Write a protein that binds this ligand. Sequence first.
Ligand SMILES: C[C@@H](Oc1ccc(Oc2ncc(C(F)(F)F)cc2Cl)cc1)C(=O)O
Ligand SMILES: C[C@@H](Oc1ccc(Oc2ncc(C(F)(F)F)cc2Cl)cc1)C(=O)O
Ligand SMILES: C[C@@H](Oc1ccc(Oc2ncc(C(F)(F)F)cc2Cl)cc1)C(=O)O
Ligand SMILES: C[C@@H](Oc1ccc(Oc2ncc(C(F)(F)F)cc2Cl)cc1)C(=O)O
Lengths: 440, 441
Amino acid sequence: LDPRDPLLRLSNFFDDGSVELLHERDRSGVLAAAGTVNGVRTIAFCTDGTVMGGAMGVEGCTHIVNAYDTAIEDQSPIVGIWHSGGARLAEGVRALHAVGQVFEAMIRASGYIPQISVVVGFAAGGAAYGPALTDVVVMAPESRVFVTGPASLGGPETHHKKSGVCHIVADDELDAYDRGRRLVGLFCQQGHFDRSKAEAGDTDIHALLPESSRRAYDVRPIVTAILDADTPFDEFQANWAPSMVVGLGRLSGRTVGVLANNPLRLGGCLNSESAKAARFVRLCDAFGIPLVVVVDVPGYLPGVDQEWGGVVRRGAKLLHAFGECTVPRVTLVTRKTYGGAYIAMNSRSLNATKVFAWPDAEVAVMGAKAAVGILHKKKLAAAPEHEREALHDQLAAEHERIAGGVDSALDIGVVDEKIDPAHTRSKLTEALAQAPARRG
Amino acid sequence: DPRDPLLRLSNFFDDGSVELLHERDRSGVLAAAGTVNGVRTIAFCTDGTVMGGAMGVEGCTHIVNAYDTAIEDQSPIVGIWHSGGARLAEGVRALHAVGQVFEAMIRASGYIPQISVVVGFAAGGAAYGPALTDVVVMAPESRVFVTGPMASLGGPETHHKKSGVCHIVADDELDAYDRGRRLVGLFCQQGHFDRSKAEAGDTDIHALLPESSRRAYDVRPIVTAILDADTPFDEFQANWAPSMVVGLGRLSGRTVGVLANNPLRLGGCLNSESAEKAARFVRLCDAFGIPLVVVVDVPGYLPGVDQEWGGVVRRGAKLLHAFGECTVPRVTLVTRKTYGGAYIAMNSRSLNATKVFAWPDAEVAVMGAKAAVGILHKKKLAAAPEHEREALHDQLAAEHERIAGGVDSALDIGVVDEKIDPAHTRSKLTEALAQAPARRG
Ligand SMILES: C[C@@H](Oc1ccc(Oc2ncc(C(F)(F)F)cc2Cl)cc1)C(=O)O
Ligand SMILES: C[C@@H](Oc1ccc(Oc2ncc(C(F)(F)F)cc2Cl)cc1)C(=O)O
Ligand SMILES: C[C@@H](Oc1ccc(Oc2ncc(C(F)(F)F)cc2Cl)cc1)C(=O)O
Ligand SMILES: C[C@@H](Oc1ccc(Oc2ncc(C(F)(F)F)cc2Cl)cc1)C(=O)O
């Protein structure tokens, strides 16, 4: 049907007048074309919902693989638009194989050219799976995903927003293209840092914290404050693993990625799904996008039935991701950062470019009460049971008053600089701009 | 004291081979060089006799230095673990130093083999460090404590063998070192393929299949049939994600990795944890030049809980990436059936499989005949009277099977390279892996 026409959809994604088909238009079920997105040379393809419901066949898959080869050869970002019931069943194994070849193209392009998927209609089988292999998936609210064993039929607002496969949910198809468009800008027009612009955007970000250090808040406004005032923050997977906020924005015009623990959920603790962070770190590392890491993390948690496997493994990926990272990655410790979670959240030991702290920030092996329970075991043990807890609290209060602390952390060298939170934005920019583009 | 580090290092290394990398102290770590059946190995042991083996700045420094040495020499490195975690009194300095150990392990990852042998209590950084290594062997008296800011305190038999972090559970401490030693030999004495040795060990492996294709069976005897008959198959994570069997062994003397769907569980289907188990294992073998045998009998994939799909979708992608990027030889053997996306993931030609073999009655298809027909012939089936619908469905299915699924069709298309006599499975696999380049695909 006319609204599902591939050339139409492609023409809606591309800059007006920039479309050049990569092959003769047929009934293969895909149409690939070159064009520009705000002037950036971009390859794109669109499944043809007007033909067998966009079902993927041999000839169609060959157009996609060809488009990928073209994008890789030119080092151009590649955007797929999806509306497809999966493989053409009647073609059998030939289509099966052809689909796998699409996957292999996507794997070859991985970390080399940006791959953006825009899901605008129905998607099942290999057409649901394809997007899963790309870097950022944008879903139109009308889009539907279906997957079954040897079963789920949902839209993004009903399922996929909360499952970490969908990165961004749009307002409508047109808006989905707009976001897709803005995504290639973020990857392919990364811009440059500007001290002046950074300084002029400075606010007392610290005022966004609640009065009690012991209580939760939403970190998102802090992210907002750091990033350029009237440029959107493109948060990924906002409703999946919400103890961890990640996404792309601009910092004095320069594309940067942000990771921030969100105390709003699970007290900001890391867990299996949030350790989301690993994949995002690899994304920015792949494409030369520097990182701002906002740390407020009291530890890590197990899953459903207190199972530890997920967080131990996903955590390992996080450690690797940061440890291997070579783009600049600056850490800001806002309130608390303890133990293994501290090590994992862009610590110095993992080659963090620079670590900043707010004056009241705390860096420690563990919580005061736990530490004190261990350090003063003799006095605690020897106490009468009815005073033991009061003693413990007294010990803990004094320990948090005189231990932890930025001054001690500066002395060791795990924190590089304590900063006035009113210059948070400008200090971050400086540290990132002064950093080498690679190594660290 | 059995927990003496030099004692433990001596029980691990070849007798007489031990040379310390530093003067003994009370830092809580002893690192040494030595040999394991001849191969130069670097090892370290936390010292349980000193502060429960708690890790401090100087001990960590000994481990980091041991890592630097092993990396420099391209020697495998083995940690023996018995530690309560960081020395709390040293505070942030010790925390920092623990991270530095992790950083060293990350630098070593994929470059030299890292083997952890957990022999005692492990907590904090001491439980976590092994999680960064390639293969974790756990002594049955080892105990891991992990906690949030409830908590978990268990041994290998009750907790960790079933959680995928522990690869191998040993019979005792000494047996743990022996498994460790054998793992060194598997990584560092990979040997070479032998065509004659392979042939002499051929059996009718098909006989290990049930007469009926609808019925479950254990794939482990099939793996055992393929590998050298008097050589251990060092299965990893046997109790975690048991629909997938992976591990290391020898094929005519040559170290190989095996991945095999196991229809004993979940019908042999892929799912979140079995995809993750395969993906890590493929990466591990790819990293160290170890060729792969992929025994495929997979009907599809399964959601999680609660029918959560997120996990299998994401871990599946990892599995696809792992095979797609793999450059060591990887040969597939389709034994019974392989369908759809699962078929793609399990080392398909589209992901640059080195060679795909199939047994004569194998089937490679987008789905089962009955299901394909339910879709292709939707109208006739619906238009059919209910009393006659099933018979019509089976008739169409039987006809459809004739032109879709079988090996002959697959051979023509090119997704299967060769149909083989199951009595020559072992030797045929050996030949394909032997004549493959050490690197490309
Ligand atoms: C040919 C077939 O293609 C598919 C179908 C499903 C599909 O999704 C998955 N494939 C494999 C796994 C894995 F690897 F976990 F087993 C998971 C999924 Cl969702 C990928 C390709 C189709 O479109 O019918
Ligand atoms: C049953 C238990 O499973 C666990 C327990 C601890 C756990 O964390 C570790 N397990 C093993 C090691 C090893 F083997 F490396 F020492 C380390 C950790 Cl952190 C993972 C899963 C659970 O989830 O409660
Ligand atoms: C210094 C500290 O070292 C640790 C403690 C726990 C620890 O475990 C974890 N660390 C981080 C995560 C993550 F990343 F998932 F949040 C998970 C664990 Cl289990 C690692 C190192 C200690 O031994 O107390
Ligand atoms: C809530 C739902 O989550 C899903 C549902 C489908 C699902 O599979 C996909 N979802 C989204 C896409 C996208 F965004 F790429 F189009 C693809 C797949 Cl395979 C993954 C998780 C669930 O777990 O049941």
